[PDB]
Ligand binder design. Structure first.
Ligand SMILES: CCCCCCCCCCCCCCCCCC(=O)OC[C@H](COP(=O)(O)OCCN)OC(=O)CCCCCCCCCCCCCCCCC
Ligand SMILES: C/C=C(/C)[C@H](O)[C@H](C)/C=C(C)\C=C/C/C(C)=C\Cc1[nH]c(OC)c(OC)c(=O)c1C
Ligand code: SF4
Ligand code: SF4
Ligand code: SF4
Ligand code: SF4
Ligand code: SF4
Ligand code: SF4
Ligand code: FES
Ligand SMILES: [Ca+2]
Lengths: 198, 589, 905, 120
């Protein structure tokens, strides 16, 4: 099952064009350039993930450009304030295709604990979001897990290869949700370690 | 005599001097648990009293705080003057090691106060915040505009008749504010911001630093007026990180507001939890046992080391060296391993409680603490040798944005910025709290000039002293309860909740409705990771807070920003921003 | 009197006990066994304070503040160490045998024992031994029993026996095995048994209807509403959760219904939660029933109304003043008729003429408890207006209160009052066609036909004053009974005459008015009370209008092709065949209602209205007081397809689209000003409640407590995005916790009682100026009409003696608390408490036609043969047949109407 | 036991449940949903649980594609075993009678004595 934005359609993918599309998606998922955007706590956990004790560089995502033109992925790592919501919208509009959005934290997901007059309740109110991460803050390894989720989503999509030949239509993959996928093993947990130990 | 008792502070000398100068009718002394003399003062004599306090033999050189309060809903105002609004001024005299509070009462219609910016230049941002959040006008203020909310914002959020939850979202307002941002960058008018000489020299170029900021401080704006590379004048634009924490303090109970206290300064964690729970313990009349004090000191010092490591690494990265941020984040991961073992979280543990801590220390925490204390000092010396002794870093940082003790005092700068001027004023030694007397540690002080380099070295010595405190805490841990025996200890101990019915009743009414604090006023001032943090709490007798005031030092530092950087370079401004140790959650909140 | 508490001087009422005096000043004293409405007994020993003899003392003495008078110059201390230690020890003693049941207990968050445990500061357990346990009884469908949680405070037995007059609940057992309940299993037969869930400070008696779909008190959304089940109008707090009505709590009103409701009002609310309700405007096309939105239905109804030639209106006493007025404005005044029968309308107008022209003051519900003699004519008060019967019980106990007060015994010493007043009581004379529930305290009961009741009333009026129309043909023993009654009423200082429209005769009300006028001519302080049938019967009577029979004739002829019917099924006031014919011949039938009725299978258009849990409005009680009820929740919050609008909003928008072709959802205050300008008699509802511009220091009034939970997850099953808060443009309340519910706010409407530290229903103490008295800053509701300066004359129309004739069985109405109100019997929980519809016959008549008990006998009314089973009634008179009004197939319009074609089936 | 304490101890308000009861008398949640897009993982619900039902496992991999899929219902939260607390049972402490536990069979509870018993 696939989603069009230019709807619900089927997989359209000839075998040579599919192979080149596979290599294009492979090169796109194996090189993701996030935008250096410092909002709040979750950005500090992102730069914790970037450092040597964690080494997100192994996935080829250590670039962290300061310009929206060079960067591909927008990580909303913090609260969407009413003053910074046009700033986030302009920074998203100043990006280039392909563009992916990862919302770090309950602030970026839904507004989090701050149901307040000066906070936008989630960045998905006005920009599309590819991957959400819960946590306040999510740990750096959760950020890497969402990075592999984004890589899996990129490796299955079918973007147009060229702007002169082909269907100019964004083909995102309706992946199986992680809750239903991991319900087979999360329920089977019986005994955990007692909290008195370390 | 308990340390949480409702004292009147009529034995304070300053009350005697005020009665000798202005007579014994001109003001009313209010008995509080704040630990400071609270004096309700007539509005017409406010500037006279402020100048008199500034001209004392040991004067009140520092305006610690200045904010309003909506008293229309306050049912318990026994002894208080008849007021609809009030404005309080918290003034700290370092020489006396004391502080006073002046409260000006205001009617509902005549909401104007004489300005305080003539006596104290740091009153500007506080009065702008009071006008923005409460609608209280200050006569004689130079540029009275909103500082927390945008200029096109109807109403005043901190009033009691203003809704606290989020309103309806509209993309049309988003497009309107986008248009405002787009014509602001093209049709900028340097007149409403209080700046003069709007490129009158035909070379005063205009630059915008933010609002996007690729660093851990957060999002903020500075509009720079430049002559070549010299900064003629700059107007900071803050409010891009305002979460409305005080309005949420009016909306959460005393127990459930602790996570919101965590996110005031997200590099602080338990250091941010400490003054709030101490003030609520003052309100409840709880004296915590010794083991609680040692545990809270342990976690506060650990988070202080974490914050100082992040600050030193980010300053070094702002100078230009790259490896120390990776190494210091490895050390932060060691700290996070210990904190995860203790509480169960990394950044915002939410582990302190009213009357103690959440759980007990796990079986084997001493091994992790010993591993961390063996891991740190060699790496800290390596950081000093690799980056902090480099002469390029010294050339970038020494002598940049320097100010004396007078500029630190008149702007309310506290922490390393105050101790780099030689003023030995640490809250952990001058006004001790949470069992800090039992530990032996040094307070590093500067020569008398606040460079970026001097502040960084002071934070390094504070890191070493925090390591000393952690060593003392590891070698000496009392055996006892992790929660107090008070009935208002929220929550009660868990096993008695699970097998006793009175404890179950206390737990049931404390997690659902909240603990009922008797109507009083409390105030706790602690030394945070970036200066002086304080919570001033007003309870009306309910299970929520009638007023939550959070004084944070990065507000005063960002207000001091245009005073010290005028006449310098833009790279000097970048280094100065890297050496202030501020986060925008701590500024705006 | 002057008291000094903890070195602070206070001025209190000198006749109050110390506990209520200190509670009225805002001081906190823990207490269990004391209630403002029940008195003091000194059982729980919780209210201990240290009393000093004079100004300078150090020892003091621990005294019970509920048993100590608040005399002048009384020096006491609450926060002394000995007193606090004793109160904590009493709480600890109560906590030794208490079960570990708080999470699974329905009183958690509403428990008085929890608040008193926290307030005394007791949180450490040292009792290590076993705890006693008790078996739990079955008390019926409404009350759930858990004797483990009892603290033996004797509130239940005191209320249920001394106040409620019930006989099947008592205390049994011994030293620590005290058991508070029935001697066996079964339902509590008292009509005020539902107040036990608020009288009991613990989780012993719980609302089983609430306990089925249970939520906690902080999770409730409340609104201050008026009870919609009879004409007394007891203020209630409906509280909902997840879009369904959850619990009806008692809302304090110091003028009407202070601490207690009846069982019908407390438990007759399950029709709001029914699944078969109309939730959308539905239009039938042939056999299909399509659903329109608001605007589509408004345009279609406007078009079909405009193509008609003449339109008529039919209101209801179940609707508010504003809704009936909006209907009347939609159809016109000259084409407006009520939804009640001609005889019912004539009785209602006669009762209203007595009320606002007879010149004799009609007391409020609280003021009934001060009258010194009660004469009830025809009305079965316990089954229709039960709370008035409770006030009559209090007025009967007033004689024992006066006899105790003659011996300098204080009012709160209820034990001494009951000891001195053993069996002497104020005279109560009830007249009914059978045995009334008040017969246990009644000085005399008159079992006779309704004409004989009116003859008795006119005979009493003639014995009181010579100018009254005499009654000839009175038996000498009955004449001696009139001598007894007139000797009781002449010597009474405040006589009271209660009757009602449910009696079913004009002459009973006329005789009551003649007795009242004769008492007034002697200078007595006579009060008079009329009971009406439904919630807003007085509103429909005051607005006037034609009867239902004129509307039925007008529809069955065919002059109007357009009829509007509001909040009515028409079978409670007219026959089913006539209504079916009139609504099938008419080509355009509009019906605005909130309950699935029987006439919706052949109605042209039906608009899903909003009930009192979903609508605002103003209703008039039987006394004549306009009371404004508010909306509890928005049905569109949990489901956007749900178009449930206010009825006056529906009719006003339809009239606006009829004239100007524009959809207009108006505001409530505009309708209030409309009824004030148009109707000078209904001009008194302007100040019943303040408008939507009313603010307490700038903020609205909160409908839910501050700890309202699940805000970001209660609707997350449908959509993860939170919707907009429902804006309440209609009134001064907001649909959230962003509001004010302070006990010291300058307001009269209170949604719920909550003080910090007082989570129980004892939090109502903080909302009154003095506890047990009026509400602070006044009580909501205002009197529409005052006392007239002259009165009516004596009604000469004396009825003749009843004659039992063969074939014509006169029907005696047997109303019930459970099963005589429409909306109450719609509830599914009432279906178990509702008894079987049993036709009651005399032994003589049953022997005459050949009946024994329990046999199925059929009778034909209006050509409809229905079969009911026979119970033998002794107190009924021969020539009458007792029938229960409001049952399945039986209408309340059959009261006082003869019945034909009665043989055994 | 669906006692609604974790929903009200939640400062975000991201817990919604509703109490239902079996025929024996035991209390269970009819449903139990936690909006994990809103939850800040503060642990106040586990601290407020008087039965130690709700717990926080050491598991961080909860990132999702759709925000609606972060609403975990009762079947997404109920695990097979006792988790971190392996032996505590609330209904052995509670005084209410359920299936397999009559009055007086709870901990530190004596057998119920009838008022009609012959002992003084
Ligand atoms: C293909 C192979 C090529 C690979 C690269 C190999 C060569 C690398 C060359 C790098 C050159 C960097 C030059 C930096 C010059 C900086 C000059 C300067 O002004 O620095 C500022 C600092 C302080 O200036 P001052 O005015 O004294 O400050 C007082 C006000 N606070 O002033 C100072 O700190 C004074 C000292 C400045 C630096 C002196 C020279 C250092 C040269 C770099 C180290 C080379 C090490 C050997 C490399 C391998 C050789 C095989
Ligand atoms: C082949 C062509 C290319 C474009 C290559 O893909 C790579 C990306 C090129 C280079 C030159 C590699 C590394 C330099 C770099 C772009 C970032 C390092 C970094 N990393 C951080 O986090 C770990 C930071 O902390 C916030 C930083 O400040 C800095 C400066
Ligand atoms: S989700 Fe929590 S950690 Fe992340 S930005 Fe928000 S408050 Fe900070
Ligand atoms: S059952 Fe309730 S009202 Fe009756 S004595 Fe026990 S605690 Fe008091
Ligand atoms: S009656 Fe009160 S104390 Fe007893 S179990 Fe219920 S909530 Fe707890
Ligand atoms: S007496 Fe009437 S108004 Fe009062 S609660 Fe009962 S049914 Fe409702
Ligand atoms: S851990 Fe999450 S669900 Fe639990 S109380 Fe905290 S925010 Fe609420
Ligand atoms: S999870 Fe625990 S706190 Fe929440 S309702 Fe269930 S038993 Fe109560
Ligand atoms: S309230 Fe006085 S002893 Fe019970
Ligand atoms: Ca409404």
């Amino acid at each position: 099952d696939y989603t069009l934005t230019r709807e619900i359609v089927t997989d359209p993918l000839n075998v040579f064009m599919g192979k080149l599309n596979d290599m294009v998606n492979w090169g796109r998922k194996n090189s993701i350039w996030p935008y250096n955007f410092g909002l709040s706590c979750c950005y500090v956990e992102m730069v914790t993930s970037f450092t040597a004790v964690h080494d997100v560089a192994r996935f080829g995502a250590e670039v962290l450009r300061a310009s929206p033109r060079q960067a591909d992925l927008m990580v909303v790592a913090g609260t969407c304030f009413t003053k910074m919501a046009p700033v986030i919208q302009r920074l998203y509009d100043q990006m280039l295709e392909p563009k992916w959005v990862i919302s770090m934290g309950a602030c970026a997901n839904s507004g989090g604990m701050y149901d307040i007059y000066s906070v936008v309740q989630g960045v998905d109110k006005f920009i599309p979001v590819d991957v959400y991460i819960p946590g306040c803050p999510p740990r750096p390894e959760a950020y890497m897990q969402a990075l592999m989720l984004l890589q899996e989503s990129i490796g299955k999509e079918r973007r147009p290869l060229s702007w002169v030949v082909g269907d100019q239509g964004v083909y995102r993959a309706n992946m199986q949700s992680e809750r239903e996928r991991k319900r087979g093993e999360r329920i089977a947990v019986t005994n955990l370690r007692t909290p008195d130990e370390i | 005599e308990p340390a949480w008792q409702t004292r009147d502070h009529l034995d304070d000398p300053v009350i005697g001097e005020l009665r000798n100068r202005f007579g014994p009718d001109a003001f009313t002394v209010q008995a509080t648990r704040t630990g400071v003399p609270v004096v309700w003062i007539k509005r017409e004599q406010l500037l006279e009293v402020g100048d008199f306090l500034k001209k004392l033999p040991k004067p009140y050189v520092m305006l610690f705080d200045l904010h309003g309060m909506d008293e229309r809903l306050r049912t318990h105002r026994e002894g208080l003057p008849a007021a609809d609004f009030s404005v309080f001024y918290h003034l700290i005299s370092i020489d006396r090691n004391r502080d006073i509070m002046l409260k000006v009462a205001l009617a509902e219609n005549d909401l104007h106060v004489p300005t305080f910016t003539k006596l104290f230049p740091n009153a500007n941002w506080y009065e702008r915040e009071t006008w923005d959040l409460f609608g209280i006008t200050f006569d004689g203020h130079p540029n009275l505009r909103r500082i927390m909310m945008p200029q096109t914002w109807k109403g005043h959020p901190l009033r009691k008749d203003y809704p606290a939850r989020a309103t309806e979202f509209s993309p049309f307002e988003l497009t309107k504010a986008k248009q405002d941002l787009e014509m602001e960058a093209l049709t900028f008018k340097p007149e409403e911001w209080g700046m003069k000489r709007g490129t009158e020299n035909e070379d005063f170029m205009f630059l915008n630093l933010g609002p996007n900021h690729p660093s851990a401080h957060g999002a903020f704006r500075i509009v720079l007026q430049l002559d070549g590379e010299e900064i003629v004048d700059c107007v900071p634009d803050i409010g891009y990180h305002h979460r409305g924490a005080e309005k949420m303090g009016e909306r959460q109970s005393w127990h459930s507001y602790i996570p919101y206290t965590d996110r005031i300064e997200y590099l602080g964690g338990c250091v941010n939890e400490m003054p709030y729970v101490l003030a609520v313990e003052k309100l409840a009349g709880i004296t915590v046992p010794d083991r609680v004090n040692v545990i809270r000191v342990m976690l506060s010092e650990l988070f202080r080391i974490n914050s100082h490591l992040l600050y030193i690494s980010t300053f070094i990265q702002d100078v230009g060296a790259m490896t120390p941020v990776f190494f210091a984040f490895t050390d932060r991961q060691k700290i996070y391993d210990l904190v995860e073992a203790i509480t169960g979280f990394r950044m915002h543990p939410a582990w302190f409680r009213i009357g103690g801590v959440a759980h007990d220390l796990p079986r084997g925490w001493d091994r992790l603490l010993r591993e961390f204390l063996d891991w740190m000092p060699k790496r800290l010396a390596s950081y000093e040798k690799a980056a902090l002794q480099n002469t390029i870093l010294k050339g970038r940082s020494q002598g940049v944005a320097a100010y004396g003790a007078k500029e630190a005092l008149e702007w309310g700068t506290t922490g390393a910025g105050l101790r780099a001027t030689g003023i030995d004023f640490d809250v952990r030694k001058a006004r001790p709290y949470s069992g800090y007397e039992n530990f032996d540690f040094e307070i590093p002080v500067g020569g008398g000039v606040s460079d970026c380099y001097t502040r960084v070295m002071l934070k390094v010595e504070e890191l070493r002293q925090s390591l000393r405190i952690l060593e003392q805490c590891l070698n000496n841990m009392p055996e006892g309860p992790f929660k107090a025996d008070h009935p208002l200890t929220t929550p009660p101990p868990k096993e008695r909740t699970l097998q006793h019915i009175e404890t179950l009743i206390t737990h049931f009414l404390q997690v659902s409705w909240g603990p009922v604090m008797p109507a009083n006023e409390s105030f706790q001032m602690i030394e945070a990771t970036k200066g002086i943090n304080s919570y001033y709490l007003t309870s009306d007798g309910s299970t929520m807070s009638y007023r939550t005031r959070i004084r944070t030092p990065s507000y005063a530092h960002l207000q001091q920003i245009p005073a010290a950087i005028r006449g310098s370079l833009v790279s000097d401004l970048i280094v100065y921003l890297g050496s202030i140790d501020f986060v925008m959650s701590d500024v705006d909140r | 009197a002057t008291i000094h508490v903890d070195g602070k001087e206070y001025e209190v009422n000198g006749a109050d006990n110390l506990l209520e005096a200190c509670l009225s000043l805002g001081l906190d004293i823990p207490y269990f066994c004391w209630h403002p409405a029940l008195g003091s007994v000194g059982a729980c020993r919780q209210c201990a304070v240290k009393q000093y003899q004079n100004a300078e003392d150090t020892r003091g003495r621990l005294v019970m503040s509920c048993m100590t008078p608040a005399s002048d110059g009384t020096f006491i201390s609450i926060d002394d160490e000995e007193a606090k230690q004793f109160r904590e020890s009493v709480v600890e003693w109560l906590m030794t045998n208490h079960p570990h049941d708080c999470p699974v207990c329905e009183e958690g968050g509403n428990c008085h024992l929890q608040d008193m445990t926290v307030m005394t500061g007791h949180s450490f357990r040292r009792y290590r031994f076993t705890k006693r346990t008790h078996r739990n009884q079955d008390l019926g469908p409404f009350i759930s029993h858990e004797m483990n949680r009892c603290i033996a405070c004797y509130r239940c037995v005191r209320y249920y026996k001394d106040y409620a007059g019930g006989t099947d609940l008592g205390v049994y057992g011994a030293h620590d095995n005290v058991y508070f309940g029935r001697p066996e299993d079964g339902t509590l037969e008292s009509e005020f048994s539902g107040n036990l869930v608020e009288i009991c400070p613990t989780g012993v008696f719980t609302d089983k209807t609430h306990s089925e779909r249970y939520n906690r008190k902080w999770d409730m959304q409340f609104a201050p509403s008026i009870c919609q089940q009879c004409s007394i109008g007891c203020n209630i707090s409906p509280g909902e959760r997840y879009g369904e009505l959850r619990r009806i709590e008692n809302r304090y009103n110091g003028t009407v219904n202070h601490y207690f409701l009846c069982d019908r009002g407390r438990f007759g609310y399950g029709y709001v939660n029914l699944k078969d309700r109309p939730r959308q405007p539905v239009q039938r096309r042939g056999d299909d029933f399509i659903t329109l939105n608001a605007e589509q239905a408004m345009q279609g109804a406007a078009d079909i109304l405009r193509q008609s030639k003449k339109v008529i209106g039919i209101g209801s006493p179940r609707a508010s003043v504003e809704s009936n007025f909006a209907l009347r404005e939609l159809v016109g005044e000259e084409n407006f008729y009520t939804g009640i029968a001609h005889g019912e309308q004539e009785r209602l107008q006669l009762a209203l003429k007595v009320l606002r022209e007879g010149g004799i003051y009609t007391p409020a519900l609280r003021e009934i408890e001060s009258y010194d003699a009660v004469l009830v004519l025809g009305e079965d008060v316990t089954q229709t207006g039960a709370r008035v019967a409770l006030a009559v019980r209090q007025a009967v106990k007033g004689k024992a209160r006066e006899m105790a007060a003659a011996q300098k015994v204080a009012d709160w010493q209820i034990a001494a009052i009951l000891n001195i007043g053993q069996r002497a009581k104020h005279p109560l004379f009830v007249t009914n066609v059978d045995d009334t529930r008040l017969d246990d305290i009644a000085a005399w009961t008159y079992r006779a036909p309704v004409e004989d009741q009116a003859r008795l009333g006119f005979a009493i009026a003639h014995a009181l004053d010579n100018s009254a129309p005499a009654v000839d043909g009175i038996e000498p023993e009955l004449q001696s009974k009139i001598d007894v009654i007139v000797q009781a009423l002449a010597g009474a200082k405040k006589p009271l005459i209660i009757s009602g429209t449910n009696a079913g005769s004009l002459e009973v009300i006329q005789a009551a008015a003649n007795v009242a006028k004769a008492l007034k001519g002697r200078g007595a302080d006579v009060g008079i009370t009329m009971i009406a049938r439904s919630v807003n019967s007085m509103g429909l009577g005051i607005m006037g209008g034609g009867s239902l029979e004129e509307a039925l004739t007008e529809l069955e002829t065919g002059r109007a092709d357009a009829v509007v019917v509001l909040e009515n099924d028409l079978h409670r006031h007219a026959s089913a065949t006539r209504v079916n014919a009139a609504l099938a011949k008419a080509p355009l039938v509009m019906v605005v209602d909130h309950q699935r009725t029987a006439i919706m299978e052949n109605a042209h258009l039906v608009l899903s209205a909003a009930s009192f849990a979903e609508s605002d409005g103003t209703v008039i009680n039987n006394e004549g007081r306009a009371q404004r009820f508010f909306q509890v929740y928005d049905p569109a919050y949990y489901d956007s397809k749900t178009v449930m609008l206010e009825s006056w909003r529906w009719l006003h928008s339809l009239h606006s689209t009829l004239l100007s072709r524009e959809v207009d959802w108006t505001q409530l205050d505009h309708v209030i000003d409309a009824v004030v300008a148009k109707i000078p008699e209904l001009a008194g509802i302007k100040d019943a409640a303040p408008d939507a511009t009313f603010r307490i220091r700038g903020q609205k009034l909160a409908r839910e407590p501050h700890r309202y939970s699940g805000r970001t997850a209660m609707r997350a099953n449908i959509s993860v995005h939170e919707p907009r808060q429902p804006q309440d443009i209609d009134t001064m309340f907001t649909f959230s916790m962003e509001g004010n519910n302070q006990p010291t706010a300058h307001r009269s409407q209170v949604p719920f009682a909550w003080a910090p530290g007082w989570n129980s229903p004892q939090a109502w103490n903080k909302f009154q100026d003095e506890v047990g008295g009026k509400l602070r800053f006044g009580d909501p509701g205002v009197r529409l009409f005052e006392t007239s300066e002259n009165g009516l004359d004596y009604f000469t129309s004396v009825p003749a003696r009843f004659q039992p004739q063969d074939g014509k069985w006169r029907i005696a109405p047997y109303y019930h608390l459970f099963g005589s109100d429409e909306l109450s019997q719609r509830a599914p929980v009432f279906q178990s408490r509702m008894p079987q519809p049993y036709i009651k016959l005399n032994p003589a008549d049953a022997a005459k036609l050949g009946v024994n008990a329990g046999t199925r006998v059929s009778f034909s009314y209006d050509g409809n043969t229905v079969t009911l089973p026979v119970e033998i009634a002794e107190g009924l008179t021969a020539g009458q047949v007792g029938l229960p009004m409001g049952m399945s197939g039986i209408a309340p319009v059959l009261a006082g109407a003869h019945l034909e074609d009665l043989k055994e089936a | 036991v669906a006692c609604n304490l974790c929903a009200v101890a939640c400062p975000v308000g991201c817990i919604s449940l509703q109490k239902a009861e079996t025929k024996d008398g035991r209390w269970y949640p009819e449903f139990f949903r936690i909006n994990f897009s809103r939850c800040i993982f503060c642990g106040l619900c586990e601290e407020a649980c008087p039965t130690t039902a709700i717990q926080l496992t050491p598991d961080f991999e909860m990132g999702e594609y759709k925000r609606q899929d972060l609403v975990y219902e009762k079947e997404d939260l109920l695990i097979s075993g006792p988790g971190k607390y392996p032996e505590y049972n609330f209904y052995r402490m509670a005084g209410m009678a359920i299936d397999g536990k009559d009055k007086g069979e709870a901990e530190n509870e004596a057998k119920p004595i009838d008022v009609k018993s012959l002992l003084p």
